[PDB]
Design an enzyme around this catalytic site. Sequence first.
Site, PDB file in Angstrom:
ATOM      1  N   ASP B  35     -20.849  16.204 -22.545  1.00  0.00           N
ATOM      2  CA  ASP B  35     -19.463  15.991 -22.135  1.00  0.00           C
ATOM      3  C   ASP B  35     -18.562  16.970 -22.882  1.00  0.00           C
ATOM      4  O   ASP B  35     -18.178  16.711 -24.025  1.00  0.00           O
ATOM      5  CB  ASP B  35     -19.072  14.549 -22.436  1.00  0.00           C
ATOM      6  CG  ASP B  35     -17.654  14.232 -22.041  1.00  0.00           C
ATOM      7  OD1 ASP B  35     -17.092  14.979 -21.218  1.00  0.00           O
ATOM      8  OD2 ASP B  35     -17.102  13.238 -22.564  1.00  0.00           O
ATOM      9  N   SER B 199      -6.224  28.610 -14.842  1.00  0.00           N
ATOM     10  CA  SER B 199      -6.691  29.271 -13.635  1.00  0.00           C
ATOM     11  C   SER B 199      -5.556  30.083 -13.026  1.00  0.00           C
ATOM     12  O   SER B 199      -4.383  29.734 -13.151  1.00  0.00           O
ATOM     13  CB  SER B 199      -7.174  28.224 -12.629  1.00  0.00           C
ATOM     14  OG  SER B 199      -7.490  28.807 -11.379  1.00  0.00           O
TER      15      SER B 199
END
Lengths: 6, 330
Positions: B35, B199
Amino acid sequence: XVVXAX
Amino acid sequence: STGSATTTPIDSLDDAYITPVQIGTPAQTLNLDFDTGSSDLWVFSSETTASEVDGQTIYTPSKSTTAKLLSGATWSISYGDGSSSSGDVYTDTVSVGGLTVTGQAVESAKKVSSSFTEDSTIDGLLGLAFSTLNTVSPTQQKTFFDNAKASLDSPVFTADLGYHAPGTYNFGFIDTTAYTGSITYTAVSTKQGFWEWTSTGYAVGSGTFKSTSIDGIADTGTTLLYLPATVVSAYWAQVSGAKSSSSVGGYVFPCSATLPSFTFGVGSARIVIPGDYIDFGPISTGSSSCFGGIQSSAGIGINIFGDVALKAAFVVFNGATTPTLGFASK
């Protein structure tokens, strides 16, 4: 979906 | 040193991925959810409330010659989906794919929430976010990656998740046979403890790429791709019959549909998520309404590049002095 450390 | 371990979807939907991890002496192998969105390595154990264990493999520290109680230490964690766990702490030898850390904090669950009990395939979590997020008190503990880093050939790990198929976590090296083209690296903020990056935009299907900054976290422990409501609405508008359902909890679409791809930007490069990766199947058994793999982050407070996005790429988690993230197509 699951959402892992909020 | 290096390590290499295979990671496998827990079910037919890729809801999560499990990777075998050796703990203790002699080894006890547990299947953990790696994770990158948390920083605690915790396991079902011989201390977990019996009524909360249902088929998981448990760690028994009393059977490990290298286990030591971390005296007085406790941990307690809450996750974004409302699940949680807590307990006490041991140190023990932990090995992933041949790479060994001695003295790793292994957080033994005394309590887990119902969703963990109900998933017999996940024996615990291995946190790979930054150690500043670790919940052990009063002495915060380091992740497996942080403890291994000084021994690694290169201070990196990579995630190469499969679509309905196994994939690989590598530690300490970049497998140049695992991706196409070049790896595009992008800056990371560690201020919130996550692999947080920006992004450069998106495209839906064959549409024109929209240049727009989207901050988010690279999270192997989240199933789906959670993005701003504007982006998600633009995606689902391209799918006949798709709608947001408050009763279901997100966007659903006719199971009869073929989904468009979704492209996200990494610098000047582009990662393409095939439409099939966005199909999470019937909302309930036998339903003709299917759950979407791209969902709004509005309820969450942060955008999350979860497995839907990451499994389309070869992803480098670069833990050098200035951390960065790399994405390549594959």
